[PDB]
Amino acid sequence: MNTLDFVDQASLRDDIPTFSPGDTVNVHVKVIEGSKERIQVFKGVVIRRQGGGISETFTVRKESYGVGVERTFPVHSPNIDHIDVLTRGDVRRAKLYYLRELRGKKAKIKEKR
Amino acid sequence: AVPKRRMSRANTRSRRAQWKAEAPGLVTVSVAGQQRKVPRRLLKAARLGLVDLD
Amino acid sequence: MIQQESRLKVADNTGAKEILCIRVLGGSSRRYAGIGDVIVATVKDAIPGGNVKRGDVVKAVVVRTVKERRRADGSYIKFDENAAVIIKNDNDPRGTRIFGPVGRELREKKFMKIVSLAPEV
Amino acid sequence: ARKGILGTKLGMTQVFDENNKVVPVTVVKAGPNVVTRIRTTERDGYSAVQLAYGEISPRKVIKPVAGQFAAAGVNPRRHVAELRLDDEAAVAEYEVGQELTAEIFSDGAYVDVTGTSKGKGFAGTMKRHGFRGQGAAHGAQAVHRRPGSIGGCATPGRVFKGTRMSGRMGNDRVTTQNLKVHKVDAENGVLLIKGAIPGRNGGLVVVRSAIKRG
Amino acid sequence: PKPTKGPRLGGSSSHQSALLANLATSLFEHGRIKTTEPKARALRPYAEKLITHAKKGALHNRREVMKKIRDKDVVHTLFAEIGPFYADRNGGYTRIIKVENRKGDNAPMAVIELVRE
RNA sequence: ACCUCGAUGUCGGCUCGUCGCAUCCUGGGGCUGGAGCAGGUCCCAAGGGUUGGGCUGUUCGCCCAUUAAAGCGGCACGCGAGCUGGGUUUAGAACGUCGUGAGACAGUUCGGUCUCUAUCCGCCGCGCGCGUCAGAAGCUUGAGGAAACCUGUCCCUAGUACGAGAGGACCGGGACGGACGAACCUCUGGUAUACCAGUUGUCCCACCAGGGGCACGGCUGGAUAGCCACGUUCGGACAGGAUAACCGCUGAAAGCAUCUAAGCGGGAAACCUCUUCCAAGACCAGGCUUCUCACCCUCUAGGAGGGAUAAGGCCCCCCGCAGACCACGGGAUUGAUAGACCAGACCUGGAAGCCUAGUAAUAGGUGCAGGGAACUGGCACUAACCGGCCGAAAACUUA
RNA sequence: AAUUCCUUGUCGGGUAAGUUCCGACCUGCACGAAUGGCGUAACGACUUCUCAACUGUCUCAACCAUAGACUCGGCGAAAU
RNA sequence: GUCAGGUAGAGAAUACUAAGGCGUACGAGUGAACUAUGGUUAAGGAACUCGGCAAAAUGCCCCCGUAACUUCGGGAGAAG
Ligand SMILES: [Mg+2]
Ligand SMILES: [Mg+2]
Ligand SMILES: [Mg+2]
Ligand SMILES: [Mg+2]
Ligand SMILES: [Mg+2]
Ligand SMILES: [Mg+2]
Ligand SMILES: [Mg+2]
Ligand SMILES: [Mg+2]
Ligand SMILES: [Mg+2]
Ligand SMILES: [Mg+2]
Ligand SMILES: [Mg+2]
Ligand SMILES: [Mg+2]
Ligand SMILES: [Mg+2]
Ligand SMILES: [Mg+2]
Ligand SMILES: [Mg+2]
Ligand SMILES: [Mg+2]
């Protein structure tokens, strides 16, 4: 019943598009580079989604310059303004941690055709 | 670790008196017309007859 | 969480491949050094014929760590390779070009040069 | 001056500030509290106010507590605490039968919560006082987690009363000071205390005005 | 089915499950069991879950019951005779009573039965 | 060599501390051959801290990074009925030397059993019995004790005071650091022996499918609950009183002088309050309230004894994040205390069956499906029972 | 040097740091040619250093199951 | 000293199993600390220790390819 729902719903965030681990997604994060509110794009694949209601989080993995970067964000965080899912993912596990050792052809994932 | 000296009679009995037992509480129950004492724990079973009464 | 006797790659064009942290600075006894922390290391392996060579003790800023690092907005950041950049005497990137990414935490102060040199974040 | 109220620790959650910063808070149900007694200098020798908390049916209440509540002129409750003020000029603000709620605290203020920490049972020294465990190899003869030495060879004789040894930790009164009250929801009489307060869930706690920053 | 939260009943692990299975089998077979207090306590929720599975039994539930019970005749009788007998009771089909202890080891003895009404 | 060779186990290292300042720093003050920073000397001050590595058993010592600091000593050169055996100081053997020799060399080298179920006191926690002049139930002042007392970087003052220049302030404020300790699971991670899914070997449920036992829970991907740190917050205070060193005010003895002989001030992380905890067994056994504030019998009414009761407590019982037992907390038919059932959040990944494409493994609709324990709200369906024990007033003196 | 007390003799290599290790210098307290002087291909549960992986040895400690410890029933010692 | 089944496996080791023999002689409960055997672990990866002491790491079948030295056999299952 989430006893604290009467306190979490007041700050909950709507317009959250449906997404699952393994689907390619790009997130827009607000940042301040010397008093300048800009929007940075982070594109990758959702490797996990820990359900915690308001504290629900999600991690995205991205390969850049031959280096992997895992960025975790709260779903209902206010620093985000857009979470666009580009292509769905056809996976079997719920937390794609095994992707921390694949490169290129091996790190690829199927899509819901 | 070994006993250095002999414990006195009083020092022994004061603690030996602690090694006692606690009598259990009883409850009156009517079975086969006769009244008998059975602890409250087995009171419920006494009604159904699952407690043998020598 | 880089600490004493910890090997970590170098992200620069100085030849040094991997360095070994000796002791953390900024405190009497600091156990770990996260992103944006300066440390002293020694080149354990470098490119033959480079500027620095094996045995030269230098200073390096801890960037692109492996363990998770929490932000002020609840987000978390973590890379897959413990790296660092050899800094100059007071504060400057020893070298001319960076290769791997850098954590935005470097933007604290006096690392604008490294932030601009890093082609990401 | 030193405001205070009783509440219950429901659980911890997160909130977001105006600058998009996460803040872990704890929900405290600072429900209505009834003022039963007022201890004055002439009566007792100190300035204090007795508050009640928690609902209870009139069947479970005891006859002495029932008579006390009747004499006070209010209904019975589960728990009863007392807040000691600093002067009669301050204690005169409270009256018998008064009802205090969460409105006594404003946003951004600092409070000092008091509760009863959880119980860990008979915990070893390493968990009680953070003792440093000995070597787990190189011949350790069953000394992996015991403290070992206890004092001087033959001079002290005793063991310096007060040494840190094994025992039952926790389950004692603790006070967490200077906690920022993030928000106060009046619709439900709830407070969002910045941080983690002692005590288990559904446990009684006493929130009071800060002392060092009040 | 809640974890015992401490040392298991029968020696080490991998044995409490078999013990509870055999106890539930004997219960569903005879209609009344006499065991140790903690054993009956651990069996109560197990037997209640098995009875709920039997009640809901239409398909895919016989498999869930067989993966825990091995006696085919016991499963068949639990599915047929009991069946909807508890279709009205919204839980609590196992009644537990305490009896006098036995000689030798003073182990609190309990008895479990299936409510009939 | 004064107890100790019918036994006091010897050096270092790990765990654990306790006490002194002849003080390494933090704090204050005097003189400086103190222009300022940075130094030299002395006095008071132990509340707190006093790092991580390489060599060598090592103590010690040298070196590498730092650090306001990497302090000196006592406690059987602290701590082996707490541990380690690296060496010293058994038995084996070798090197060089000593002696014609068995052998020896505070010279070296390889190796070489570390025993005991705590009797008493000491200590860390928890109960029983009784006392606080009737039985008790709530809320508390509190003597007297316990806990903490750390400290660095940058930014204004100010590139000003100072200083030829280089160089470069005290004081007063702001922001951010490392360590210790307390709380918590809210975020991130570690643990999950009745949770979900893949799978090798093997047997079994007649057989396919689907399942079960064993091989570390057979192995992994995970995994909600409690616990934990690697994770999140919070304490270090501000302020008040008297002081050490020191600086002083009016002032004679001794017409001047003098911090003193009569008095009056400032004065530090030292001292006491001030911050957290325990505490009326504090025997001066505390203080403010509330309930019960009334029934018999025997001894020969001096007082005592037994029996039965009110409030209250305890016993039996369902449980907790409370817990070794004990004890604590909630309930007990006027109840959601626990077990079951429903639903929610959450974990796991697409369950058994039917049908379809593929000779085949396999995939697709029935399907955010099937399964699940700690978190939550309802539901008396099951257990708290037609139930047992303790449990309340000599009296006298003054006002 | 299993041989050197002076000694942590001096130089070079190894680590940022080396009374350990390797080669050389020879000032042989007190090496030395069958109580053998110079090593060996392979080898050694003989001793030492370094090198890649690895891991809770450690930073730094944390939880899970077992036989005890803990409570109950029965039997029932000990050294001193 | 003699019988030597089956399934994977080179195998009389390893895991289960057919016939056969046993649960063997004190038991029931309790997440205390702690004693002893295993399992797990974010980052460093021997930095603990006199000393890689104990755990972990490579570990099976078929192939490419295997150095210095050497008495010419070997190193070698080198390594990868
Ligand atoms: Mg051991
Ligand atoms: Mg001793
Ligand atoms: Mg003697
Ligand atoms: Mg002094
Ligand atoms: Mg003080
Ligand atoms: Mg060391
Ligand atoms: Mg010899
Ligand atoms: Mg080394
Ligand atoms: Mg010779
Ligand atoms: Mg020879
Ligand atoms: Mg016994
Ligand atoms: Mg036998
Ligand atoms: Mg245990
Ligand atoms: Mg590890
Ligand atoms: Mg790892
Ligand atoms: Mg080994």
Side-chain angles (χ1 to χ4, degrees):
Chain A
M1 286 287 170
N2 192 15
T3 295
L4 301 179
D5 58 351
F6 72 101
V7 190
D8 300 357
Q9 67 193 356
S11 72
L12 267 180
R13 180 156 193 168
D14 308 338
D15 72 270
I16 293 286
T18 185
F19 75 105
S20 278
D23 316 325
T24 314
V25 74
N26 44 345
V27 184
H28 295 243
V29 199
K30 301 175 193 170
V31 71
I32 40 165
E33 259 179 351
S35 70
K36 189 184 161 189
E37 263 191 6
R38 69 189 202 75
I39 284 156
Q40 165 161 330
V41 305
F42 185 90
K43 166 162 150 59
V45 181
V46 185
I47 59 173
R48 90 194 164 193
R49 186 178 181 188
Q50 291 180 330
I54 189 176
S55 65
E56 182 155 316
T57 207
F58 72 97
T59 308
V60 181
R61 187 180 181 75
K62 184 183 79 155
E63 170 48 80
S64 56
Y65 308 89
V67 165
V69 187
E70 278 181 13
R71 192 75 189 283
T72 310
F73 289 117
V75 177
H76 309 290
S77 159
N79 266 115
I80 323 186
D81 60 319
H82 273 282
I83 302 170
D84 285 31
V85 283
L86 314 178
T87 56
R88 303 286 163 172
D90 259 315
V91 298
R92 310 296 297 283
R93 311 288 149 187
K95 306 178 147 46
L96 314 182
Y97 290 132
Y98 66 93
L99 298 168
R100 296 166 172 172
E101 300 93 332
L102 316 185
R103 261 89 189 163
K105 287 263 198 162
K106 307 225 169 185
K108 203 175 164 288
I109 312 181
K110 306 177 201 169
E111 303 89 337
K112 300 250 190 190
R113 88 198 200 288
Chain B
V2 304
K4 191 84 183 288
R5 260 54 147 282
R6 172 173 195 173
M7 189 157 272
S8 159
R9 290 163 57 75
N11 282 342
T12 305
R13 270 82 187 286
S14 61
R15 89 196 183 161
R16 183 160 289 168
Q18 310 307 293
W19 182 75
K20 60 174 83 71
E22 281 191 355
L26 303 174
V27 156
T28 58
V29 194
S30 53
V31 192
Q34 57 173 5
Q35 314 301 306
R36 267 180 153 160
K37 289 234 172 198
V38 160
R40 212 220 182 185
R41 186 168 176 284
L42 322 184
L43 169 59
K44 192 169 193 160
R47 302 159 195 172
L48 312 179
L50 307 176
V51 181
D52 162 50
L53 307 172
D54 304 310
Chain C
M1 283 179 194
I2 310 308
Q3 67 190 29
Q4 172 162 335
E5 288 283 2
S6 306
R7 298 164 180 286
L8 56 157
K9 172 168 162 202
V10 198
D12 60 351
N13 55 312
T14 62
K17 217 159 285 306
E18 62 189 0
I19 52 176
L20 188 134
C21 175
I22 308 312
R23 272 298 323 288
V24 184
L25 311 182
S28 72
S29 86
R30 209 162 161 174
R31 309 199 161 287
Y32 319 126
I35 311 188
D37 287 356
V38 304
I39 54 171
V40 282
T42 65
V43 184
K44 287 286 194 194
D45 193 356
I47 292 169
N51 305 130
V52 302
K53 41 182 77 64
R54 204 171 75 270
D56 317 324
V57 66
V58 299
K59 275 180 183 184
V61 69
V62 176
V63 62
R64 175 144 94 274
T65 55
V66 164
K67 184 65 192 293
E68 288 84 351
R69 199 80 195 285
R70 187 218 190 74
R71 292 267 161 170
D73 66 327
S75 167
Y76 286 78
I77 310 183
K78 60 162 278 168
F79 304 81
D80 291 326
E81 309 90 331
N82 303 286
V85 182
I86 304 174
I87 60 176
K88 221 170 219 162
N89 198 323
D90 44 300
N91 237 323
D92 168 278
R94 168 62 153 161
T96 321
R97 176 181 56 176
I98 310 302
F99 296 125
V102 299
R104 179 172 300 287
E105 302 209 342
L106 298 198
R107 282 192 69 76
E108 35 165 28
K109 210 219 296 188
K110 207 67 164 59
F111 295 123
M112 316 333 286
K113 186 67 173 292
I114 285 156
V115 167
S116 53
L117 271 162
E120 208 168 3
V121 189
Chain D
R2 185 109 169 283
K3 306 167 196 171
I5 186 157
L6 261 65
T8 320
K9 185 195 172 84
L10 269 57
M12 297 192 68
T13 179
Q14 266 160 229
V15 297
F16 295 116
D17 288 357
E18 83 305 336
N19 50 56
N20 316 341
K21 275 183 196 182
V22 74
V23 182
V25 291
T26 312
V27 159
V28 188
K29 180 172 173 178
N33 289 84
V34 189
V35 178
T36 60
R37 204 81 171 286
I38 173 160
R39 322 286 228 180
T40 56
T41 38
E42 306 102 320
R43 190 95 75 165
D44 305 84
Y46 65 104
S47 54
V49 59
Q50 199 192 78
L51 316 179
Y53 190 74
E55 283 176 346
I56 183 59
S57 44
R59 198 273 309 281
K60 303 191 233 164
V61 75
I62 330 301
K63 300 205 90 170
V65 179
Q68 278 188 358
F69 273 107
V74 309
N75 281 352
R77 301 294 169 91
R78 285 285 299 279
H79 318 82
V80 188
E82 185 160 315
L83 312 180
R84 183 176 168 195
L85 311 195
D86 307 322
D87 45 347
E88 293 287 337
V91 88
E93 304 180 8
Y94 305 137
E95 304 179 6
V96 179
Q98 190 169 334
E99 203 167 351
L100 293 159
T101 184
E103 263 72 0
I104 62 180
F105 287 117
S106 61
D107 295 317
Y110 296 82
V111 299
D112 291 357
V113 305
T114 293
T116 314
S117 57
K118 288 155 116 69
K120 322 302 201 166
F122 195 104
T125 66
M126 294 182 69
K127 188 158 184 171
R128 257 172 83 80
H129 325 282
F131 269 35
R132 311 175 66 74
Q134 319 207 13
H138 298 304
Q141 192 79 23
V143 198
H144 299 309
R145 296 174 70 73
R146 58 207 203 172
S149 168
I150 202 168
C153 211
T155 323
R158 61 228 180 74
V159 280
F160 288 121
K161 303 164 53 48
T163 324
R164 318 200 284 173
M165 308 167 84
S166 71
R168 264 185 62 192
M169 84 190 286
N171 200 348
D172 49 353
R173 175 158 161 166
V174 196
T175 302
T176 308
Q177 339 183 30
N178 281 316
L179 298 173
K180 215 186 177 180
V181 45
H182 187 272
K183 204 177 162 187
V184 49
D185 192 296
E187 298 179 2
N188 328 308
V190 168
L191 257 64
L192 309 186
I193 308 304
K194 183 175 168 190
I197 71 191
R200 54 133 173 167
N201 285 331
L204 192 85
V205 306
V206 188
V207 66
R208 201 110 162 282
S209 161
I211 324 188
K212 310 176 175 188
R213 278 161 136 285
Chain E
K2 195 177 184 182
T4 184
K5 184 235 177 180
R8 272 63 185 160
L9 302 172
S12 66
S13 173
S14 92
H15 180 212
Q16 190 188 242
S17 74
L19 259 167
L20 293 171
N22 269 258
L23 288 174
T25 287
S26 290
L27 171 54
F28 302 139
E29 175 165 5
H30 304 86
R32 154 159 36 197
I33 217 167
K34 171 161 182 173
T35 59
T36 330
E37 162 163 341
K39 277 165 185 164
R41 312 239 170 173
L43 176 70
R44 161 157 178 192
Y46 196 75
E48 296 245 316
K49 283 275 174 198
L50 292 182
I51 291 156
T52 303
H53 266 91
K55 286 212 304 194
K56 303 165 156 188
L59 191 52
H60 157 269
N61 307 128
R62 187 87 74 151
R63 309 284 214 290
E64 291 289 299
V65 168
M66 281 186 68
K67 67 163 65 168
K68 271 167 181 75
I69 308 303
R70 290 138 199 74
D71 275 22
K72 300 289 279 276
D73 297 327
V74 171
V75 169
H76 157 81
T77 182
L78 161 140
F79 259 82
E81 198 276 324
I82 307 184
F85 182 61
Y86 296 129
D88 58 320
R89 305 192 80 78
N90 202 44
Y93 330 105
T94 49
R95 200 184 301 164
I96 183 162
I97 302 151
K98 286 138 284 201
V99 296
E100 84 305 344
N101 313 335
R102 56 174 166 191
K103 292 186 74 58
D105 57 338
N106 177 23
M109 291 199 97
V111 164
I112 222 169
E113 310 173 327
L114 309 178
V115 301
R116 315 305 303 263
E117 176 49 44

